[PDB]
């Protein structure tokens, strides 16, 4: 789709956990991944 | 334009990515962006500084704002160094909704670990 609805849609695909790796790399989007929720760590997080 | 910035980190996101453009150089175009959306919660701050109740945005659209802010490394202007040590001095503070805390959360980028430095710098001389 989009940009924004990508960063969004992702972030659904993530904020559960779908493990594409793509992002994790893509400079960009990996640092969204990480750290763009806050920092890339959580309190308890969906990602134990 | 500036409603995207509080909309959706999705939104902010893509409006700073695509308004100014992915040029990966030396290029200084598109600056007056990232620097208007800088200003823009520069305000936001600046204004928070005391106790007026912060509105809808300085917790979610000045951020988006800051978020569209490439202010970066190498010798900048004294907005950078600024700004700097807005986000960390005012991590040195309380009660409204801004800091360098929360700015290091969400402002990890490829234009922000050297104005990060510049914080450290400028930031020992707040402290």
């Known amino acids: ?48 | 334009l500036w409603d995207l910035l509080r909309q959706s980190p999705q939104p902010a996101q893509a409006l700073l990515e695509l308004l100014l453009e992915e040029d990966d150089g030396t290029g200084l175009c598109h600056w007056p962006l990232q620097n208007a959306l800088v200003d823009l919660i520069r305000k936001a701050l600046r204004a928070l500084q005391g106790p007026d109740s912060v509105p809808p945005g300085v917790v979610d659209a000045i951020y988006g704002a800051l978020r569209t802010l490439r202010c970066p490394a190498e010798p900048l202007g004294v907005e950078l160094h600024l700004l700097c040590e807005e986000l960390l001095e005012a991590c040195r503070t309380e009660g409204s909704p801004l800091r360098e805390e929360r700015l290091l959360s969400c402002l990890l980028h490829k234009a922000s670990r050297g104005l990060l430095s510049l914080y450290g710098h400028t930031y020992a001389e707040k402290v």
């Open chain 1, 1 to 48: 789709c989009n940009n924004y609805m990508r960063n969004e849609i992702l972030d659904k695909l993530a904020r559960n956990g779908v493990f594409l790796a793509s992002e994790l790399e893509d400079f960009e989007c990996f640092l969204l991944r990480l750290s763009r929720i806050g920092g890339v760590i959580q309190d308890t997080l969906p990602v134990q």
